[PDB]
Amino acid sequence: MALYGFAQGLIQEAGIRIKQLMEQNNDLVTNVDKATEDFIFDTILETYPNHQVLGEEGHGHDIDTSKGTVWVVDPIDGTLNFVHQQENFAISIGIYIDGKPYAGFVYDVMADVLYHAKVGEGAYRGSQPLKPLNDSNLRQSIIGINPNWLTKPILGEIFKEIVNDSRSARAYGSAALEIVSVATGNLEAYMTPRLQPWDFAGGLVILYEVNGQASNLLGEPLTISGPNSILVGNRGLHQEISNDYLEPHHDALIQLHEQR
Amino acid sequence: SMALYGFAQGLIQEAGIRIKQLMEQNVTNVDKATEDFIFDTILETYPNHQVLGEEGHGHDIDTSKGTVWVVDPIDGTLNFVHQQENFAISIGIYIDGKPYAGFVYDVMADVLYHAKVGEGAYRGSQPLKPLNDSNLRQSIIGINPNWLTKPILGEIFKEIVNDSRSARAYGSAALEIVSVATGNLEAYMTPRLQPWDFAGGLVILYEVNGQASNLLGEPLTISGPNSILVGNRGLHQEISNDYLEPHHDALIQLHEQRF
Numbered sequence: 001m002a003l004y005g006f007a008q009g010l011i012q013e014a015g016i017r018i019k020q021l022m023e024q025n026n027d028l029v030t031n032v033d034k035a036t037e038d039f040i041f042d043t044i045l046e047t048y049p050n051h052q053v054l055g056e057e058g059h060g061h062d063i064d065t066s067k068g069t070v071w072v073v074d075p076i077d078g079t080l081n082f083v084h085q086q087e088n089f090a091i092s093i094g095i096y097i098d099g100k101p102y103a104g105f106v107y108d109v110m111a112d113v114l115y116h117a118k119v120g121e122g123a124y125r126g127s128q129p130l131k132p133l134n135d136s137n138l139r140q141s142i143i144g145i146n147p148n149w150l151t152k153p154i155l156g157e158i159f160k161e162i163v164n165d166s167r168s169a170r171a172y173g174s175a176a177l178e179i180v181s182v183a184t185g186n187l188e189a190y191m192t193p194r195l196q197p198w199d200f201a202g203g204l205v206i207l208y209e210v211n212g213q214a215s216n217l218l219g220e221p222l223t224i225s226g227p228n229s230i231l232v233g234n235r236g237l238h239q240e241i242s243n244d245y246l247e248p249h250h251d252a253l254i255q256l257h258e259q260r
Numbered sequence: 261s262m263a264l265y266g267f268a269q270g271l272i273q274e275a276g277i278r279i280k281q282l283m284e285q286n287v288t289n290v291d292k293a294t295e296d297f298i299f300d301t302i303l304e305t306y307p308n309h310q311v312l313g314e315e316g317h318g319h320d321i322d323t324s325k326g327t328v329w330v331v332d333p334i335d336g337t338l339n340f341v342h343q344q345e346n347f348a349i350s351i352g353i354y355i356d357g358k359p360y361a362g363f364v365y366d367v368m369a370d371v372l373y374h375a376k377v378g379e380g381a382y383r384g385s386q387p388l389k390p391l392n393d394s395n396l397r398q399s400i401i402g403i404n405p406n407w408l409t410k411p412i413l414g415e416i417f418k419e420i421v422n423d424s425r426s427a428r429a430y431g432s433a434a435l436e437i438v439s440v441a442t443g444n445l446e447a448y449m450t451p452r453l454q455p456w457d458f459a460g461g462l463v464i465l466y467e468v469n470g471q472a473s474n475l476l477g478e479p480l481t482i483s484g485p486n487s488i489l490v491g492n493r494g495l496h497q498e499i500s501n502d503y504l505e506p507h508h509d510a511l512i513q514l515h516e517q518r519f
């Protein structure tokens with residue numbers, strides 16, 4: 001809890017630094033993103049020059065994520081929200097050691113709420129412990145899914161069936177916060193066909209602590225080594241969405257996947 | 261009158277704290293408590309006021325007579341159940357068929373959106389700036405995934421979803437109307453909504469020069485349910501004239517079926 005404390009503090013400074021630029025003011029968003037990852041990357045290597053960093057903004061492209069201590073960071077998850085709402089965005093940081101998860105952090109800057117988790121030690125929202133997730137049926141569940149996905153060829157019919165059955169659907173525009181929302185019980189499931197390592201790195205650690213699960217749309221495991229599709233939910237309904245709704249269209253999904 | 265405004269603005273907050281207490285004193289229970297507390301408070305004080313709300317409260321009222329309170333005691337009941345937040349008390353007031361005040365109270369955030377006709381719109385003490393026009397292309401819109409599933413309506417809404425910068429869905433109409441009032445969404449749509457879903461957010465919205473209609477570009481009134489398109493004027497004009505009005509007749513059909 002020296003690396004942890006240090007990770008914990010940095011994500012929070014990075015946030016306040018963001019608030020500080022915003023108030024000093026879509027070219028804005030492009031700087032800020034850049035300036036924030038550059039701040040995160042510079043502060044890390046100045047103390048831990050052996051630590052590797054995989055960033056949204058380009059740092060560590062094609063790194064071996066399984067060697068040494070590896071920070072995977074997205075300085076702003078929810079750029080559009082950042083630009084149009086000036087809120088509902090987050091910094092995401094997962095720290096892996098030898099390929100194994102150590103810590104996750106996702107910080108809702110404008111709410112000033114930090115979701116944090118060290119592996120084996122439980123999940124937190126601010127300083128309140130998160131409870132382990134209960135099982136639900138899709139029919140009493142609220143699902144996180146973007147309307148844009150429902151317009152697609154193939155993918156659309158598939159998500160249609162599952163939107164129809166869901167109690168109801170939401171779309172917040174930040175994958176890290178929505179993974180977090182699942183970890184908090186606020187969404188029973190979240191799904192999307194494409195996401196990059198930094199978008200789920202921080203949040204999966206958190207989720208693993210309250211026993212939620214993450215797979216891609218084909219039920220296979222997620223790694224920080226490459227991009228993928230995403231299905232996150234409590235144990236019972238993840239099993240339900242994959243077994244019933246996705247996996248009979250396996251071949252249609254392997255194909256879009258092999259394309260994308 | 262000012263007493264009327266004061267009393268209403270007071271009452272909605274008051275009912276709000278009661279909901280925090282009932283929860284803390286731990287939704288169907290909470291929702292009855294809220295609807296009885298509001299209605300009884302209105303009426304102990306204004307026996308002549310009319311009240312229109314859920315479960316046939318005020319049904320077949322003549323909404324153009326006297327003072328009508330159009331109340332949804334918890335808007336976003338599902339978010340209440342599953343999230344214990346992002347729900348709202350919404351209260352719209354009309355007088356002689358005409359809007360007067362609108363209140364939407366985000367209870368767990370403790371934020372009162374409020375407005376009185378011709379005197380600007382507020383979020384607590386802060387004035388809301390008027391909206392600027394946006395095109396659809398740089399706009400985020402509120403539309404629930406459910407509505408892109410429907411056979412004919414889906415097709416119509418796909419068009420606008422593909423076009424917009426991105427879409428969102430929050431599970432509260434009153435907050436999503438309000439989110440347009442704030443500039444937080446540029447537009448929000450849905451094929452069905454009750455008068456108590458929109459009555460409050462509509463007053464707040466026209467005080468920042470936002471626009472309301474149904475999907476056919478007709479005025480919304482508090483005399484029936486309806487479809488809804490809300491936005492800044494520029495893009496409510498782009499959406500209506502470019503993506504909905506070309507299918508006026510499909511929409512008239514779907515509308516006739518739905519109601």
Ligand SMILES: Nc1ncnc2c1ncn2[C@@H]1O[C@H](CO)[C@@H](O)[C@H]1OP(=O)(O)O
Pocket residue numbers: 074076077078079080172173174175176194195196199
């Ligand atoms: N290729 C892409 N295009 C748009 N959003 C993407 C994306 N890949 C991942 N995302 C993520 O999906 C969510 C968009 O609702 C965000 O979490 C967004 O990250 P970003 O905000 O940093 O672009």
Ligand SMILES: Nc1ncnc2c1ncn2[C@@H]1O[C@H](CO)[C@@H](O)[C@H]1OP(=O)(O)O
Pocket residue numbers: 332334335336337338431432433434452453454457
């Ligand atoms: N069947 C229906 N007809 C009209 N409005 C509905 C509806 N079902 C849900 N809504 C309302 O539309 C929004 C999205 O569901 C919510 O504000 C919700 O109000 P409620 O939460 O009080 O049920």
Ligand SMILES: [Ca+2]
Pocket residue numbers: 056074075076077078079
């Ligand atoms: Ca980003």
Ligand SMILES: [Ca+2]
Pocket residue numbers: 056074076077078198199
């Ligand atoms: Ca991202």
Ligand SMILES: [Ca+2]
Pocket residue numbers: 314332333334335336337
């Ligand atoms: Ca309600």
Ligand SMILES: [Ca+2]
Pocket residue numbers: 332334335336433456457
């Ligand atoms: Ca309602």
